[PDB]
Subunit: 150 residues, 6 copies
């Protein structure tokens, strides 16, 4: 249950007032919020975030958009939260996302897909370390932990 | 193209069960743009033409009668992939097969009371839109959120 | 009488901000019956007539221009006390004075972008309904829930 | 349309304030509520309810947890309600449950999966008879029945 | 915080699928559910429930309607729950009820006002005793009690 | 419209999973999020934040509780946001709060009233400066600003 993942509301998600909605879905699921911030990514930060896509033709547009305004960065904790977080978000391409998921309910275009979630335990650890300083994470015990976990 | 359009209807059961606002909200929340909207009472002949492809099916008479038994809300929605995407929002035709999160998955039980309709293709959408709406009844406008919803 | 009617509009800001479904849902949830619905683009002259009582006010030109700047959704709702009750659902005219739970209390900040309109009396409702809707555009039907909502 | 199923909010679901939410989803779907009660299962009741799983390694924990606090028992009536009720709940193991379902939206751990639904017409009849006395079930007609059923 | 009140969803509220919604609002507020049942009031029970209105001209209609189909009876526990429960319901006459309340959001007619709440500590105790047997109430501790109460 | 206020989800609000809900209400209203973070107040921080109430008999309990676990701090921007933010929260004492407001919907006890909002333009400026560093606030333009403001 101490697994952690990085979830972000992308600039489109902030602009379209989906921050609270996204946070609510993670809270409702049983996951625990241990880091939260609002920040405007720099271009260098955007380049790193999208580094796997550096050779794609839409990279420069993605990097520019991701650094064009604020995101909300989050760290969530819970059993299977990396994979579970992504299930909440829905398929990467909103054409594939199902209703009930964040992208299924709210997104149409793969380049404006509202949010991001780490794709593995390892990439989660890297992303958390990239976006948050040690002193910015909060460790606490949910009063509901024994209701959510056996 | 983001200028694709589809026809969505709330069927008489959906109107009677107060699902009009809920259905509209889901389409708005998705990012689709409302360009036509009206409340109307279909005639039996209108229902027959709308469902003409299904004239030989055993449920046709019942469908036609029910569709014309009270008001529907007709809508035209605009957006990238909206024909296919609209139907995904509605859920499987038979509510037994619809998933929670979809309109039929959340709100319907019986295939003959499945709350709503969506065009099944670009071509049938164009026909349905022209059938239910006059040219002057559609409204062209630009969503202030278009650049937040679409990359181009 | 339960056959009282009022005109409610989602103003251009309400349409742009995706509040059409939300507003309709609140009226459906309350028990009111939808008997007219359309999306339309008011003209400046239509906006001037609709707000004619306010011609001398300093905000009139701005109001008229804004009301005609993009689509509205016009509605006719039917029910006991619906004129007064509809306005209660909308909340105080100036959103600074609107309470949470109302449409303006939950969703609006500025009196000039207050999301919606409702007729202020039985008489002005009748005038507004006749102004925005033709006779053939209203739909008369019976809600299957009328005896659950009304004692008589 | 007179098929019936037994649905329970398990002790974790009651503790986490999901009773209203779960009822709402069944009402919204078109199913009819014909029995409803809050009760504290005994250990012996839990054992019988789960008797088919007596040999499974999680049985003792399940039986103990199911009897650890109040549940809300329900009987719902409608066409295909046994199978349809389970679709609303979502897969048994929340790791497999999809967003939009009760367990997909609200649960993380298979041992804290919020709710129960009968798995067949036959087991539904048994469970209903087990949890409810005849006088606790109400026969009535929904004024919306012709809007929900052809 | 051990104050208790009787809340009912009237037959109109059940018929119009407002049970879950009403329960959710009480759960969300922080109140604790200690009794719940679905039942069809008898005519004699309706007469007692409306006894203060015996001389009013609409009494016989009220008594008939209240005994025409199921209600959901509830007992809720919490600090100030009698008065607080009524605030959630809204003013008795829906013409006076404010949006945000149950009647403000969902009712139009004073004779079809969806729900009932006890009007005092004393009338609560009487109503609870009238609608529930001792063995039907469940005493339990919400895992959230220290989050809701100082 | 550039007025700003400080809003906090108090430790009880975070524990009870009301962060998303509270953010959603502010987003829905039309206010703009310009600062957001999760943090654990220290006792000294709580004391300074509530310094005007040092002589009141509940002070020591308030200071201790406010520093007992994480809060979510927020800065919101908009016309009349200081006064308007407080209207969204509801009266200080939940007994007085109306349904529709955060405390009206979710709180029972004045010592567990879920959230905080600055009480004036001047106290807002102080609180913002106290909880947020300059680099933690983001200056951006909502694409919806002309739809919300005349
Ligand atoms: O063909 C593509 C593929 C990806 N993306 C964007 O690039 C992001 C990161 O791509 P990745 O393959 O990492 O998807 P994710 O990990 O977000 O599912 C996605 O979320 C998309 O917004 C895009 O615009 N076009
Ligand atoms: O066995 C069936 C199949 C379909 N329908 C109804 O006929 C409509 C049109 O059927 P179609 O195959 O066009 O499905 P849709 O395009 O609505 O998914 C459906 O929406 C159903 O309401 C029915 O009553 N019985
Ligand atoms: O000082 C004002 C008063 C009113 N209005 C606008 O004018 C409309 C009509 O004003 P009226 O007094 O008719 O209020 P309503 O009937 O809409 O409550 C309102 O809805 C506002 O949008 C404005 O912009 N400034
Ligand atoms: O590996 C498992 C499988 C099941 N269960 C629990 O045992 C219950 C009954 O199992 P069953 O196969 O009957 O699932 P259900 O009928 O609830 O879908 C489930 O709901 C779970 O709470 C568990 O703790 N571990
Ligand atoms: O003029 C009236 C007054 C009351 N009632 C009904 O009688 C119930 C009980 O009346 P009471 O004065 O006890 O109101 P409550 O205690 O429910 O607020 C109300 O909830 C109404 O539904 C009515 O039909 N007409
Ligand atoms: O009798 C009281 C009054 C206030 N408070 C707490 O002290 C906080 C600050 O009091 P203030 O008068 O500043 O209220 P606020 O500014 O939060 O409305 C409140 O929010 C309550 O949590 C309390 O515990 N008991
Ligand atoms: Mg990725
Ligand atoms: Mg078809
Ligand atoms: Mg007016
Ligand atoms: Mg089973
Ligand atoms: Mg009374
Ligand atoms: Mg203060």
């Amino acid at each position: 249950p101490s697994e952690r993942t990085f979830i972000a509301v992308k600039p489109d998600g902030v602009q379209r007032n989906l921050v609270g909605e996204i946070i609510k879905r993670f809270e409702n699921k049983g996951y625990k919020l241990v880091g939260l911030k609002l920040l405007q990514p720099t271009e260098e930060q955007a380049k790193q975030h999208y580094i796997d896509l550096a050779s794609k033709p839409f990279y420069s547009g993605l990097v520019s958009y991701f650094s064009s305004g604020p995101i909300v960065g989050m760290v969530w904790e819970g059993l299977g939260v990396v994979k579970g977080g992504r299930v909440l978000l829905g398929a990467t391409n909103p054409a594939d996302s199902l209703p009930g998921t964040i992208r299924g309910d709210f997104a149409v275009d793969v380049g404006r897909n509202v949010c991001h979630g780490s794709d593995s335990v390892e990439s989660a650890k890297r992303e958390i370390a990239f976006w948050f300083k040690a002193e910015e994470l909060v460790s606490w015990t949910s009063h509901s932990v024994k209701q959510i976990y056996e």
